[PDB]
Amino acid sequence: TQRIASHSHVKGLGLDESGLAKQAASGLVGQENAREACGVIVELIKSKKMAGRAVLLAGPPGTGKTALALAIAQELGSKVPFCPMVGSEVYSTEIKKTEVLMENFRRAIGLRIKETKEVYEGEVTELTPCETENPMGGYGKTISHVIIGLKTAKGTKQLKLDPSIFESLQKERVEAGDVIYIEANSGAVKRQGRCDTYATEFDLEAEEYVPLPKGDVHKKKEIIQDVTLHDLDVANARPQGGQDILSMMGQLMKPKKTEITDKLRGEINKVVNKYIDQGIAELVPGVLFVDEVHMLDIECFTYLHRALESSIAPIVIFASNRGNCVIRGTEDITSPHGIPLDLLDRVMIIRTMLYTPQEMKQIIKIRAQTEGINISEEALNHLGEIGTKTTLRYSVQLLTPANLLAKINGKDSIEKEHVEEISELFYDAKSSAKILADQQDKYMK
Amino acid sequence: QRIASHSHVKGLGLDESGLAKQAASGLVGQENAREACGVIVELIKSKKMAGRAVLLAGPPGTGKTALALAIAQELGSKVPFCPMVGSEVYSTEIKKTEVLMENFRRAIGLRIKETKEVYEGEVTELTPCEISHVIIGLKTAKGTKQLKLDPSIFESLQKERVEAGDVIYIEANSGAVKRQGRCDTYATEFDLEAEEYVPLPKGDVHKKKEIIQDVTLHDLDVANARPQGGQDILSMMGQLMKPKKTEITDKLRGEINKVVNKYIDQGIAELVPGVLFVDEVHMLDIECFTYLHRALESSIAPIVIFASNRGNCVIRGTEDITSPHGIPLDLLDRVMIIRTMLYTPQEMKQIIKIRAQTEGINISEEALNHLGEIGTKTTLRYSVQLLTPANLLAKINGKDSIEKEHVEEISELFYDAKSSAKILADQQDKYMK
Amino acid sequence: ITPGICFSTASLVLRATDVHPLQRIDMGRFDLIGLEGRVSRYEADTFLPRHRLSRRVLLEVATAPDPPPRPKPVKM
Amino acid sequence: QPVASPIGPRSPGPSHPTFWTYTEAAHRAVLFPQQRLDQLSEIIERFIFVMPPVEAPPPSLHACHPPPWLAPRQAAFQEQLASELWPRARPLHRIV
Amino acid sequence: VTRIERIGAHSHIRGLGLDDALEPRQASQGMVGQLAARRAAGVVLEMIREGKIAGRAVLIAGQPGTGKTAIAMGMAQALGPDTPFTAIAGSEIFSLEMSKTEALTQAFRRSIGVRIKEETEIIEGEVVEIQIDRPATGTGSKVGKLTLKTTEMETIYDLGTKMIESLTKDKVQAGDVITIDKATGKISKLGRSFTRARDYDAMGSQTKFVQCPDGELQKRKEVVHTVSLHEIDVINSRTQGFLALFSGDTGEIKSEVREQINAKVAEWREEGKAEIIPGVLFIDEVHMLDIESFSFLNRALESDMAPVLIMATNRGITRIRGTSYQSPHGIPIDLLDRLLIVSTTPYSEKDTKQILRIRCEEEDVEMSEDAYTVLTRIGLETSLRYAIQLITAASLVCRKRKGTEVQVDDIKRVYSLFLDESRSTQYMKEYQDAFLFN
Amino acid sequence: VTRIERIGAHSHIRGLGLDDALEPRQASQGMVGQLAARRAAGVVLEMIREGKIAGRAVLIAGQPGTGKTAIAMGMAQALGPDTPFTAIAGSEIFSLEMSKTEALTQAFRRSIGVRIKEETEIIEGEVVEIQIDRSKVGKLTLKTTEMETIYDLGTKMIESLTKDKVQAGDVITIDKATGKISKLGRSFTRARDYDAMGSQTKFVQCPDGELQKRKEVVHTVSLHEIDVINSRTQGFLALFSGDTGEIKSEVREQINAKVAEWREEGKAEIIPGVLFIDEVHMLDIESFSFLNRALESDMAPVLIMATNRGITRIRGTSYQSPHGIPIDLLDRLLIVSTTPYSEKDTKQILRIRCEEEDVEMSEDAYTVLTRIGLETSLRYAIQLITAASLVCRKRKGTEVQVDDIKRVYSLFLDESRSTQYMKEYQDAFLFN
Ligand SMILES: Nc1ncnc2c1ncn2[C@@H]1O[C@H](COP(=O)(O)OP(=O)(O)O)[C@@H](O)[C@H]1O
Numbered sequence A: 001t002q003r004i005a006s007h008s009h010v011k012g013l014g015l016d017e018s019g020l021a022k023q024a025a026s027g028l029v030g031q032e033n034a035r036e037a038c039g040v041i042v043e044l045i046k047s048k049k050m051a052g053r054a055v056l057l058a059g060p061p062g063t064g065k066t067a068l069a070l071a072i073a074q075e076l077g078s079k080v081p082f083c084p085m086v087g088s089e090v091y092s093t094e095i096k097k098t099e100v101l102m103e104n105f106r107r108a109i110g111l112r113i114k115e116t117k118e119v120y121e122g123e124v125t126e127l128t129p130c131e132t133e134n135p136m137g138g139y140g141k142t143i144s145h146v147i148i149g150l151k152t153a154k155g156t157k158q159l160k161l162d163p164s165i166f167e168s169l170q171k172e173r174v175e176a177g178d179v180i181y182i183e184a185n186s187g188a189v190k191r192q193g194r195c196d197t198y199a200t201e202f203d204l205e206a207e208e209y210v211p212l213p214k215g216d217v218h219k220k221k222e223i224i225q226d227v228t229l230h231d232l233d234v235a236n237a238r239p240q241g242g243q244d245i246l247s248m249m250g251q252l253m254k255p256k257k258t259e260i261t262d263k264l265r266g267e268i269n270k271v272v273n274k275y276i277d278q279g280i281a282e283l284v285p286g287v288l289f290v291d292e293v294h295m296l297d298i299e300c301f302t303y304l305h306r307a308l309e310s311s312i313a314p315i316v317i318f319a320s321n322r323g324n325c326v327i328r329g330t331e332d333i334t335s336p337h338g339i340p341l342d343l344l345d346r347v348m349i350i351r352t353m354l355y356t357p358q359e360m361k362q363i364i365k366i367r368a369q370t371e372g373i374n375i376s377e378e379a380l381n382h383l384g385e386i387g388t389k390t391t392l393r394y395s396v397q398l399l400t401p402a403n404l405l406a407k408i409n410g411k412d413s414i415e416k417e418h419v420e421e422i423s424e425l426f427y428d429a430k431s432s433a434k435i436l437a438d439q440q441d442k443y444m445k
Numbered sequence B: 001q002r003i004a005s006h007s008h009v010k011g012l013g014l015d016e017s018g019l020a021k022q023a024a025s026g027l028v029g030q031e032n033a034r035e036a037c038g039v040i041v042e043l044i045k046s047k048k049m050a051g052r053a054v055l056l057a058g059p060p061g062t063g064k065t066a067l068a069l070a071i072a073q074e075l076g077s078k079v080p081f082c083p084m085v086g087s088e089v090y091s092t093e094i095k096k097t098e099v100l101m102e103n104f105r106r107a108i109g110l111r112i113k114e115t116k117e118v119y120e121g122e123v124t125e126l127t128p129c130e131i132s133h134v135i136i137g138l139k140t141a142k143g144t145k146q147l148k149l150d151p152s153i154f155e156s157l158q159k160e161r162v163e164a165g166d167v168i169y170i171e172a173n174s175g176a177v178k179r180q181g182r183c184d185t186y187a188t189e190f191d192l193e194a195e196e197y198v199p200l201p202k203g204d205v206h207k208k209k210e211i212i213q214d215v216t217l218h219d220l221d222v223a224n225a226r227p228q229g230g231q232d233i234l235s236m237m238g239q240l241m242k243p244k245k246t247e248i249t250d251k252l253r254g255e256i257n258k259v260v261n262k263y264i265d266q267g268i269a270e271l272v273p274g275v276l277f278v279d280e281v282h283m284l285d286i287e288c289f290t291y292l293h294r295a296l297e298s299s300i301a302p303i304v305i306f307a308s309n310r311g312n313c314v315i316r317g318t319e320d321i322t323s324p325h326g327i328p329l330d331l332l333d334r335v336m337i338i339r340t341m342l343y344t345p346q347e348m349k350q351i352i353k354i355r356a357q358t359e360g361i362n363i364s365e366e367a368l369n370h371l372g373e374i375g376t377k378t379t380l381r382y383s384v385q386l387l388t389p390a391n392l393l394a395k396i397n398g399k400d401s402i403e404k405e406h407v408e409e410i411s412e413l414f415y416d417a418k419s420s421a422k423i424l425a426d427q428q429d430k431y432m433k
Numbered sequence C: 001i002t003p004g005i006c007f008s009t010a011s012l013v014l015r016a017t018d019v020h021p022l023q024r025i026d027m028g029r030f031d032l033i034g035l036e037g038r039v040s041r042y043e044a045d046t047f048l049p050r051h052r053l054s055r056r057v058l059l060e061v062a063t064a065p066d067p068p069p070r071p072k073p074v075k076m
Numbered sequence D: 001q002p003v004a005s006p007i008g009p010r011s012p013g014p015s016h017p018t019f020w021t022y023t024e025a026a027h028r029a030v031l032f033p034q035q036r037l038d039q040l041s042e043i044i045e046r047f048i049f050v051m052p053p054v055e056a057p058p059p060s061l062h063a064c065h066p067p068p069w070l071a072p073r074q075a076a077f078q079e080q081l082a083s084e085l086w087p088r089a090r091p092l093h094r095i096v
Numbered sequence E: 001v002t003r004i005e006r007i008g009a010h011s012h013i014r015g016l017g018l019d020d021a022l023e024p025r026q027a028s029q030g031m032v033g034q035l036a037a038r039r040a041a042g043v044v045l046e047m048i049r050e051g052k053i054a055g056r057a058v059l060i061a062g063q064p065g066t067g068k069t070a071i072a073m074g075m076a077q078a079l080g081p082d083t084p085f086t087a088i089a090g091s092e093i094f095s096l097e098m099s100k101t102e103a104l105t106q107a108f109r110r111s112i113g114v115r116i117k118e119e120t121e122i123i124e125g126e127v128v129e130i131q132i133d134r135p136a137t138g139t140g141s142k143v144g145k146l147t148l149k150t151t152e153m154e155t156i157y158d159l160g161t162k163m164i165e166s167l168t169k170d171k172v173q174a175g176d177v178i179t180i181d182k183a184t185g186k187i188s189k190l191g192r193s194f195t196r197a198r199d200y201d202a203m204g205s206q207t208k209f210v211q212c213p214d215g216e217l218q219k220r221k222e223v224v225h226t227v228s229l230h231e232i233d234v235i236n237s238r239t240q241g242f243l244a245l246f247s248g249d250t251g252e253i254k255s256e257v258r259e260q261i262n263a264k265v266a267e268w269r270e271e272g273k274a275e276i277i278p279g280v281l282f283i284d285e286v287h288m289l290d291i292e293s294f295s296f297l298n299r300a301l302e303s304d305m306a307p308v309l310i311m312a313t314n315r316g317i318t319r320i321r322g323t324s325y326q327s328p329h330g331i332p333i334d335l336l337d338r339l340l341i342v343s344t345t346p347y348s349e350k351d352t353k354q355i356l357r358i359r360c361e362e363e364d365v366e367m368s369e370d371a372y373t374v375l376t377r378i379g380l381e382t383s384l385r386y387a388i389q390l391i392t393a394a395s396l397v398c399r400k401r402k403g404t405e406v407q408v409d410d411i412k413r414v415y416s417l418f419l420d421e422s423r424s425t426q427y428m429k430e431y432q433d434a435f436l437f438n
Numbered sequence F: 001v002t003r004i005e006r007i008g009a010h011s012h013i014r015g016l017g018l019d020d021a022l023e024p025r026q027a028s029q030g031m032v033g034q035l036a037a038r039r040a041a042g043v044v045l046e047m048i049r050e051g052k053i054a055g056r057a058v059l060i061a062g063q064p065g066t067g068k069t070a071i072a073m074g075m076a077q078a079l080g081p082d083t084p085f086t087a088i089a090g091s092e093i094f095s096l097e098m099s100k101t102e103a104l105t106q107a108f109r110r111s112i113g114v115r116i117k118e119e120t121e122i123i124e125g126e127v128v129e130i131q132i133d134r135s136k137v138g139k140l141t142l143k144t145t146e147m148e149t150i151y152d153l154g155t156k157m158i159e160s161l162t163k164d165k166v167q168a169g170d171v172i173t174i175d176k177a178t179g180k181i182s183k184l185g186r187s188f189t190r191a192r193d194y195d196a197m198g199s200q201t202k203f204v205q206c207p208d209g210e211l212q213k214r215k216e217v218v219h220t221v222s223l224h225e226i227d228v229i230n231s232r233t234q235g236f237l238a239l240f241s242g243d244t245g246e247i248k249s250e251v252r253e254q255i256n257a258k259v260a261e262w263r264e265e266g267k268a269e270i271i272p273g274v275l276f277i278d279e280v281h282m283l284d285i286e287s288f289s290f291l292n293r294a295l296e297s298d299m300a301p302v303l304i305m306a307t308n309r310g311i312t313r314i315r316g317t318s319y320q321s322p323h324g325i326p327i328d329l330l331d332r333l334l335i336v337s338t339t340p341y342s343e344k345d346t347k348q349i350l351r352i353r354c355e356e357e358d359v360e361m362s363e364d365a366y367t368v369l370t371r372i373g374l375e376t377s378l379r380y381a382i383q384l385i386t387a388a389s390l391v392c393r394k395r396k397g398t399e400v401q402v403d404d405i406k407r408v409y410s411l412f413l414d415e416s417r418s419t420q421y422m423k424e425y426q427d428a429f430l431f432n
């Protein structure tokens, strides 16, 4: 968080309340049409009524595609799931590519569970059965309640409980002076140790003595837990916590991703629907961002048709900087973005354009502000001129070396000389390619 | 019972002299091929030759698989018949040669006499004897007997929750203890017990039964390579940690051969050499063919029937080596080739009528002639596959028989391969790739 | 149910990997993975450098007489 | 131990922040293998019937004069493994 | 609140929309046009429902966006949940855990259901009073008594030890409506007829009550158990197979196990114990299968346990995967001879407009007639899916400007914002050097 | 004596040889020439030391023998051992156990060090008596050289003491918070003169001071190590075996959050480091695509790369790119170019190598060797240094002369002469 990454300045899409894109806002400069389209996509995600919709961000490299996706993620917030992914990740040594894609799809669909946990805390002061003056059957003693006195920091309360709790109390070996908690939703007694006020400095027990509970005896709170469908799938496919031989084998054996079946996923879907109907949970459909989609092969592209045609799928955002490239897994088949036309027919294409020198200068200034770097006007103009040739990434990557060089020279700002020296020290792609071409005999291969 | 593609094939339709009747046992033509298959059936029944390979060669739709299943029907259910497709050797667990060898051993069967020792009765006493043995008392309608059993049997009884009064079945050979229920005599004691009651056994406490077991060499190999008969912790551990198939060694197969020869010498086993059928042999690669050379040269191998519809085609696994059936000439030198021929329109009509009778469909003569004409173009398979949709159409319109109009309607609704090819050629710019 | 396979081999084969202790070195001086879950950083870094025995202390303890018996507890 | 799961670790009590983080609804959506067995009891009773055609004990290694320590060591290893693991294999009794 | 299932591509398709004579209506149950293809799908559906012919294969072939998957989904919705319907993509059979033939076999056997129907004795009533007497110390025989009540009956039951243990484990109290199966002794609580005593604490909020059951106490009810062939294979393959039913990780199931299961299911069918419910396997984009998978399909369709196979492909004369051979639909001619091909014709203007109207109705989007005309023109010029996406895009744009009906201006706005394949390719040609490769 | 570290190809490099202004000296810390490249490396090293910016990539490009790996080793040496420096080759990401992206993720998380700091109260003493009444309640007596006290035990403490078989004379430590007991050793008495000892028993002195002590442990671990620890129940074993597999992304996110929590609490500190991939051209296009977006994380180290390829073919594709690297990644990185060395630089490098190997050479020998190095290659001359030293020692000489260099030049061939001799007898060799 404290370290500054490549998209650390993107705080969202700089959109007016009417959806029109401001020239410079929220860390984004230019790309007004793409930003407006991404705002429409954000509204689509927030509507939560569409499944399987796909958006392809198409444009030359270094045009804000990843920045736009991260701005969308910022607009949605942390509540909405956002699963970034590169196309190379489908190639796994454990599971098939379609399984990786399906798992990321289920990772993008989140579920928020709200529950109220009501507990009774306290140190047991009293443990008294409530006998009945008329014993049932004539002989012996019959009890109708068990009075348990619970003491906390700021109160003391007595609880008339069901007689059946006497067995739980004996099983937990609960005596006076012990700290216990009873859960209303289950009616069970759990002994969380003995009070620390009865411990002496000469005792050696570690987990036996506990502090007297703070707050009120009756504690109730609303628990909000955010989970994804993939979390439930994984927890059910390779369960952890059993005491049978299969759980022991799972613990012993090396963990391995498996091809989760449609049966388990259908069961998870049924459970999620049941929770939603009960009011416990609320579905939070999020976004799956697949950067470098062109790295997917023909099998992944073919599977994506069925994946997007599903009624449970999230909204998928693709990104590709390729031109009329050859689809991977095929022999000499060319498609406009490296993506077969069948999948391009299922996506909405958002075009990102190149940046004018003024927009490049603005982006450089924003990056300098983010990195805590003071740059003079002449140095900024020179660096923007450097960015007119070479690329924008080279210019934004010369900021920190130049700042270090200035600090070594003893100056608190980057001057033009520092940028010139850094440009001399570090080469861009085009200059290096020129050097390689001029000396192709001396290099290898 | 559902009607499959070869449900009408009941035999080779041969006479007593071995000659092929024209239409018999669901077969219409291929008289030379049927006579050759009868010779092959007699060879299999001889149980003298080993590793004799036969190739069924001909265009698709000429009844090669029908002839193989007819050979199976002639042989009977006792003789093993393992059908495998050439695409099945490409497993992700074991090597292709291991798959081929396992399918070779699956074809050899063994009928072995076995005696089962059974302890069956109501438990009257379950006294542990200190590792703690068990002394058990069993009663039937004929008597009572007391037995001393191994601690493993006591553990099994505990796992079955066997208590005094329960009817149990013990197999002494496998040590398998089954609790069948609480005895019927105690079914009146309670009104809700959550128990299943069983009558008292009416035989003796100790019984010996002799039965005939049908097993294959592959079953013995698997049982001796992934053992689960010890009922010890190590067997469970091996089963749970190593569930995948393994490449069984030649040493294990030699030991199994020795054991089976010993059983046959003892007179309690009978060998049934059996048949292996590989349908899409062209889907094997050159390594599989090279292995099959030596495998067929073995004196243990079964009779293998191969099939292929390929012409002069490139052998899989090779770059550009082309062989007459997709099979290298070395393996073709080791096979007897049975040639299947294309069917005449009359034979097509006969096959259509047989399929209609098999599927319980009444078809008029005009409809039969029209469907045979449809089969003259396109293929016989398409004409046969139009019978059920036409029957459904006739049933919808209230007719109990197929008329020519129903056949015309079905042919209009469903295209064949040639019509679809024409459509693709006419609209190549609109379809993908 | 079949009897198991009895695989018979030479008795000398089962001793092929066996090496007499007088012919092999102690590999426990290179046992790094055996220390995990048993040896702590405290033992290696702070305690042992301070509380390693010396030959002088060992000889003094060995030569010295037995320590006097521990006095019985007295409620005082 | 349950890292990155809807199931929370064993919180000592409400004093621990983990007590108020996880829900019982999430817990009930994850089924242990024992719960799965209880869920498929009728299916197990009705549909599990396939028996191996042959059953054999594992191959045994025999030498005339084996090292007298190998067999007792294997016996002790098997005994300890059985004493630790056989109680955990009881749920699979009906399947076996 | 939004359920796990939302508006998808084929959410408007509720069935094939045919009449009794399998004559397709122009617009019914979401389907518009494709009359011949829908009639063929209805005939295939009748063949599936009859369930008498094994291993029938149908190929739905046509241009992209002609309704192949729409027809498949309509068939699936018309079949109903009773009949199995396994829909997979061609890419899904390429697995590192199992062979391609094994994956195809599992797909086939997930499409056949085995149903076991049996009658059991069932006790359903309201618990009036339960008494359980147990020894104070040491092992002993628990003795108990249970009283159950209906609207017309009330019986007092003497309980055995195991039923006592079951009741103790289930924590059955007075007022709980419980179900007891006499054979297995399983007890299932299905509600409370009334509340517990109010004077008790730490009890929680009492839920709603359940009316007491009527009729006799011990009834006889029919219990139906339905599993697929694949589930039987998995649970019989190994001891841990039931977990493999959810985790996958089945490996390759032995052919011996499958042969035994086939024999046993045939025996059950002959003995009247079980009925076989054949279903459908739908392989979308079957052109991704290689030659080995097709060769396996050739002979796997010849079994009597094979389901109806439905394939969809939009390929013309194309190279078969794994080979260098050009074939129609990317499928070898040997497999093409075993299957009937159903062609889908392209949609007209009125069919496109009706599809757009159905989509708008599904998405709860109100659109003007001029907007419908413009959107239909765009769909004819570009594609149907682009217009479908612009439906929702224009709905969102209209809602942003506090509107109620999607106008031509909103459609133009989303047409400018979002590009089709053609305009994107044009703009990429305009800046070809800026893009990386070619 | 001969230690495990011996004279290698970069044993003479101790640093980048820069001053306080990052101006490279002509010959300092074992580096000669490459002034611009060394200055760029120093700037990158200052960037690494600051640690503010994440995911910075630098490519050291140049002709073979121009000092790319020399510069990388100089950067590694100049950087302290405190800061992680993971040096891998490009071929090492092709694993049979985990994917290429998983290998690159593991290398990235191996390049970030996490320094932990735990302070714990402990009881430390020698056991005098253990009395247990009946496994219900008991007393334990512990002593130091200056102290002795008795403790009342509970059920779990008694069970833990019985499990560890703690008896009299054992020196143990007990953690107050968790109660875990580890045995340090046992005290030596006259009666404990064992003739045979167990593999774990060792005799230690009775601790001095006070029975209650505070234990402070400071150690540096990487993110990958924490991932492997928390991957499975005994995941620390995979830190030795390497059988890690593909770690779940959820585990990594949880560990990132926990590490951030530790950093906020003051219990841990982050030391971002360097991942050096040498000969990156062996990476496939998928690996480059993964690297493109892996560098964009906030927990990404500095990625230093080195290739000697010209415009060549990218592995896994049919495209030609200036370094074998797709131009999208090349736009994400700064390129440091190395120039070929001059005669003076070659002679100075030969002198440094001779000093490193402790070889005395005459000036005529140095001239001849420099001429050979310019004509054939620098590495050939470097090898001839040791060859001539050995030949000189064989003839009982003390200083390498021109005759020794000529002798080893005739004995050992460079690539050009061997290729010529092969072309002379081309038909003899196989598969031309
Ligand atoms: N319009 C913009 N406004 C502000 N920053 C931008 C803009 N476009 C790109 N950037 C920044 O410049 C860098 C270029 O990367 P990016 O354009 O996201 O790559 P890609 O084009 O592959 O998505 C990113 O770090 C991004 O944060």
Ligand SMILES: Nc1ncnc2c1ncn2[C@@H]1O[C@H](COP(=O)(O)OP(=O)(O)O)[C@@H](O)[C@H]1O
Binding pocket: B005, B006, B007, B009, B026, B027, B028, B029, B030, B058, B059, B060, B061, B062, B063, B064, B065, B066, B067, B309, B351, B354, B381
């Ligand atoms: N001579 C025949 N008589 C009756 N039916 C036949 C005959 N030949 C083939 N058939 C039927 O035609 C179909 C094609 O047979 P098949 O053996 O699959 O062809 P091939 O093996 O040559 O590809 C099968 O369903 C079979 O039942």
Ligand SMILES: Nc1ncnc2c1ncn2[C@@H]1O[C@H](COP(=O)(O)OP(=O)(O)O)[C@@H](O)[C@H]1O
Binding pocket: E008, E009, E010, E011, E013, E030, E031, E032, E033, E034, E063, E064, E065, E066, E067, E068, E069, E070, E071, E314, E355, E384, E385
């Ligand atoms: N005849 C039709 N009736 C209703 N909706 C249709 C029809 N044809 C296509 N669609 C819809 O158009 C969209 C794309 O059609 P689709 O079936 O995916 O084309 P393809 O046949 O190439 O798979 C789907 O969401 C589908 O619901």
Ligand SMILES: Nc1ncnc2c1ncn2[C@@H]1O[C@H](COP(=O)(O)OP(=O)(O)O)[C@@H](O)[C@H]1O
Binding pocket: F009, F010, F030, F031, F032, F033, F034, F063, F064, F065, F066, F067, F068, F069, F070, F071, F308, F349, F352, F378, F379
């Ligand atoms: N500037 C330098 N100073 C000292 N030695 C150098 C220098 N440059 C290269 N060398 C030596 O040359 C040899 C080859 O250079 P190296 O950097 O290892 O490989 P390359 O540069 O070809 O990738 C190394 O043994 C190194 O010691």
Ligand SMILES: [Mg+2]
Binding pocket: A305, E068, E069, E284, E312
């Ligand atoms: Mg489709």
Ligand SMILES: [Mg+2]
Binding pocket: F068, F069
């Ligand atoms: Mg190098």
